[PDB]
Amino acid sequence: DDIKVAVVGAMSGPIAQWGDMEFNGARQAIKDINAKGGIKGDKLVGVEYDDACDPKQAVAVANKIVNDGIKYVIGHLCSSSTQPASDIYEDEGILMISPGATNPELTQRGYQHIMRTAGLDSSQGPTAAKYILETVKPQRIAIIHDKQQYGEGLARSVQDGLKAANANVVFFDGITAGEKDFSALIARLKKENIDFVYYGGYYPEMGQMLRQARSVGLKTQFMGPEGVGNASLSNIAGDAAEGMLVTMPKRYDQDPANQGIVDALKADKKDPSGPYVWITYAAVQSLATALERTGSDEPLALVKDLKANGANTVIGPLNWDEKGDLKGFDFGVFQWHADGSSTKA
Numbered sequence: 001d002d003i004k005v006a007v008v009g010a011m012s013g014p015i016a017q018w019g020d021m022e023f024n025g026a027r028q029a030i031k032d033i034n035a036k037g038g039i040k041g042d043k044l045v046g047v048e049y050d051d052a053c054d055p056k057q058a059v060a061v062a063n064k065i066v067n068d069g070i071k072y073v074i075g076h077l078c079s080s081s082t083q084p085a086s087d088i089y090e091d092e093g094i095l096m097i098s099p100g101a102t103n104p105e106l107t108q109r110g111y112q113h114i115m116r117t118a119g120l121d122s123s124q125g126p127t128a129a130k131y132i133l134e135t136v137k138p139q140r141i142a143i144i145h146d147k148q149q150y151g152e153g154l155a156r157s158v159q160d161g162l163k164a165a166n167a168n169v170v171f172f173d174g175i176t177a178g179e180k181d182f183s184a185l186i187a188r189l190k191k192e193n194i195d196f197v198y199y200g201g202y203y204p205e206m207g208q209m210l211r212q213a214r215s216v217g218l219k220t221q222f223m224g225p226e227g228v229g230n231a232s233l234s235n236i237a238g239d240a241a242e243g244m245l246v247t248m249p250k251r252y253d254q255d256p257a258n259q260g261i262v263d264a265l266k267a268d269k270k271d272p273s274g275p276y277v278w279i280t281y282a283a284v285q286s287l288a289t290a291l292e293r294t295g296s297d298e299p300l301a302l303v304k305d306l307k308a309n310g311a312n313t314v315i316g317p318l319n320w321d322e323k324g325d326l327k328g329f330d331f332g333v334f335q336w337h338a339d340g341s342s343t344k345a
């Protein structure tokens with residue numbers, strides 16, 4: 001019979017563009033797998049849910065998935081929405097592979113039904129700190145975050161990494177997500193002669209912060225995690241996007257092996273350049289590899305099979321550890337430009 005698979009992420013809310021990549025990658029993977037014969041004759045069917053990357057809505061979607069009879073879940077997208085949903089899935093015995101959540105706490109609580117194809121912030125954070133200490137070498141640093149699990153976790157990780165080398169972190173503060181007016185922050189950066197800022201958060205706040213800093217002549221160097229590295233960033237920031245540092249996953253769309261999938265996305269007039277297009281495609285490929293190899297429909301047996309044998313996907317040969325995290329998922333550093341393009345630094 002038809003194998004149903006929930007795909008869960010942001011189809012609405014302020015970071016819906018990340019979700020656009022997720023659903024584009026999932027749809028294409030489900031379509032390619034069915035085109036080659038499915039899972040031993042059976043058809044994969046994606047069932048799409050919108051949690052809006054919001055903790056409360058995520059708990060509502062997870063509850064609905066249990067009630068709908070679905071046993072496998074590619075989601076959720078954000079860390080703050082994925083973690084509370086995983087509590088429900090673990091209790092009900094449902095497989096959950098997150099293509100987007102990078103916060104470490106997800107897979108550090110003994111949950112047996114939980115995996116991910118996204119990286120870890122326990123590696124993205126230290127990658128930023130290393131680059132700050134060794135290449136940028138600023139005199140005076142401020143670290144800002146958006147008071148949510150992903151951004152605040154990365155901001156705290158960069159604070160610790162810098163403080164390990166006794167770098168001058170002048171101050172550490174948060175701003176509320178959805179902020180329009182950053183004039184108070186900018187005034188503090190001028191007062192404290194801050195020449196470098198790490199922002200933990202997503203692209204809507206990064207964009208407006210960059211534009212407003214340059215409008216009054218701040219010469220500050222900014223940096224953020226992969227959550228700011230979006231096509232929207234330079235549209236919001238304008239010329240202030242130039243020089244922006246950001247940690248991102250490898251450019252999977254420039255891998256020759258993925259050129260067939262790039263061409264399929266370009267035929268549907270879709271942007272193939274986003275990291276989570278590929279990381280989500282990979283999560284469907286891992287679920288399909290486990291169903292095919294074992295011939296089983298038990299969530300626990302599918303996870304054990306993946307931890308043991310791995311899977312060959314569009315983001316490389318995947319090798320999970322006992323907790324459900326990928327081993328050897330590396331972030332690189334990129335200089336952003338005003339036209340939305342970027343180059344490795």
Ligand SMILES: CC(C)C[C@H](N)C(=O)O
Pocket residue numbers: 018077078079080100101102103118150226227276
């Ligand atoms: C899509 C990504 C920007 C999501 C981010 N890694 C998080 O855990 O919230």
